[PDB]
Amino acid sequence: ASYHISNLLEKMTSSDKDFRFMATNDLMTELQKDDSERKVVKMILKLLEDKNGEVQNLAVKCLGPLVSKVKEYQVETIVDTLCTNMLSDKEQLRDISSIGLKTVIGELPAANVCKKITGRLTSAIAKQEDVSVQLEALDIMADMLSRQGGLLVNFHPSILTCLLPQLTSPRLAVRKRTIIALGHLVMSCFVDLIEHLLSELSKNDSMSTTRTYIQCIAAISRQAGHRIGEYLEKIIPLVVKFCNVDDDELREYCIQAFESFVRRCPKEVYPHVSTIINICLKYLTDDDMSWKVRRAAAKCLDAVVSTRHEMLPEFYKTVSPALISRFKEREENVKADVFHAYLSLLKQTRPVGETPLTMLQSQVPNIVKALHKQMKEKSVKTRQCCFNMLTELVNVLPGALTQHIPVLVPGIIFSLNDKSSSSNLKIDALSCLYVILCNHSPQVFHPHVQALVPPVVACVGDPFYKITSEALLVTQQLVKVIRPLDQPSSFDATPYIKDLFTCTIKRLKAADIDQEVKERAISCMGQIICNLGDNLGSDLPNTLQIFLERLKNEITRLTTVKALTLIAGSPLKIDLRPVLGEGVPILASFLRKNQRALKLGTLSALDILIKNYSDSLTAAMIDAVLDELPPL
């Protein structure tokens, strides 16, 4: 209201701090929910010079949303006044002006402000005694190019030719800001501007080169690399001829390659750069740098492996996999990156003139001895990388490492039994052991049970739940493997019966244990019973009540039913008649709620139970089952 705004202006304009604060809160609340605009703009401009910090913050925050309702006549005036104050002496006023400009441009979506600011900065960016002005101007231009970048019909050439001499500034910071601004400009970008930019860069290349030009080329290519296809054929030769230099400058040259492959996929120049990086991986002479130059080559290998899919025989038939495999005894970063590259390659090996299977099989022994040599290290990261490598090599195809289990078992045993091992290391080791046991045939795991049972049994009981669940999975897989009913086997597993049973029944109790561990223990018990329960005769007719009491619980209802189904459908007879009388009504009572998975599971359990065991069946359970059919 007119009277309201007049009263607010009168009360606030009393040289007071608290009253100004409350008035600012009031006008921001009003904004959120001809002469007055002039008055408020003038008073905000006056407050902009106030020494108080809170008042200046309130005014500059109010300036943001104020542009929506303010007139479009004095916006140029306030912008010009802010730009004039930008050239003041006191640094605090400089910071206030920069904050205000950034705020208004942030809240901006009238359009003459952008033209005015870019036109003024075109002259401002020119050479000046102060370097702080240049840094602030470069930051502002970066903000424009990140946010603006629309029409700019006749403003891009001026800013371009004005920012070109700024690339040779002695300060590294100014060079970085100019490079960032150029990258933002090309990203926002027109039909010919990049042509003159590339021509100038090429002309400057045939001179006393510096890291600035290569860094700028890499930045502009990363921001926009889909419009440089005809210039490359002179770019790579320059990099190759400038690589053979004694001084350490190959970093940016090698960085250019991986981004070049990432941006432009189709190009028939791969062999030359590939050979260049293969040779460059060999440099081996913080004062020392040679432990870091190979990082760029490793990133190059990562990019080239990821992008290329249709020339697997070319990669495999060369010495590239061999050179990658042998180049392992290096620093932690180099080892990690070559491991990452090989994992990416193996993940790529899956389908999307011999087949890749032959060369993979022939290189398997080499990978095996390389991994075995790499096992003798106390670093956790190397152990996790090796376990992930083994898991990937086993998962890619079944029956791969069928001739190296005896030499690979001790490494897993040491990694599981050592006191200095992280939770992730144990988890990945257990997962690798489980997947190896699952994929490979049981015939290559019989002699190793004496070595695989103690550590798995010990690892079953751990405070963590992920480790315990993985150990239970490994135990179930080992129990299934050691006694395969599909093919007859000749081995005595009597000592392991009680050893597995103690841990399995110990983890089957509540003991404030998480749901996942309880479900895994239930599954392990079900598998153990189904495939081995003839040995367990004393605890068979008394431990079945645990499943009956757990059936009522909703948290563990599917797993126990699946375990019961597996137990009932066992070729070896399992005694369940005393439990059948008290178990069937429990399963029948659950046929009321809407749960397809639970319904199917309990139906399967009852079906297999009545099929395998039907000697003793009363009439109450049959009537209860029949009455529960219409709801199903």
Binding site: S15, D16, K17, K51, N52, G53
Partner: protein, 88 residues
């Protein structure tokens, strides 16, 4: 017997006004010592939460004293400009 020499020191200095460290102008008492009106009635955490404030002009005064001075004027007693708050 054992002796050695030091090359550089690189010391750090903390400058402050003599009047401020001597005593606060609002109440004629030591700035280190707690004010009188707060200790006159101790029945809550006021006696402990009371501390010395700061400003742009590098001048230290008690929070209660400067708060009381507010609404009588907006000036610090010995330097004649608008009071500012930066840290507790």
């Amino acid at each position: 017997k054992k002796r050695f020499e030091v090359k550089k020191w690189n010391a750090v200095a903390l400058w402050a006004w003599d009047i401020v460290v001597d005593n606060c102008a609002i109440c004629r008492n030591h700035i280190m010592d707690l004010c009188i009106e707060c200790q006159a009635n101790q029945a809550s955490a006021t006696s402990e939460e009371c501390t010395v404030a700061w400003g742009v002009c590098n001048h230290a005064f008690h929070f209660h004293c400067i708060s009381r001075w507010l609404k009588t004027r907006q000036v610090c007693p010995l330097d004649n400009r608008e009071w500012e708050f930066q840290k507790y």
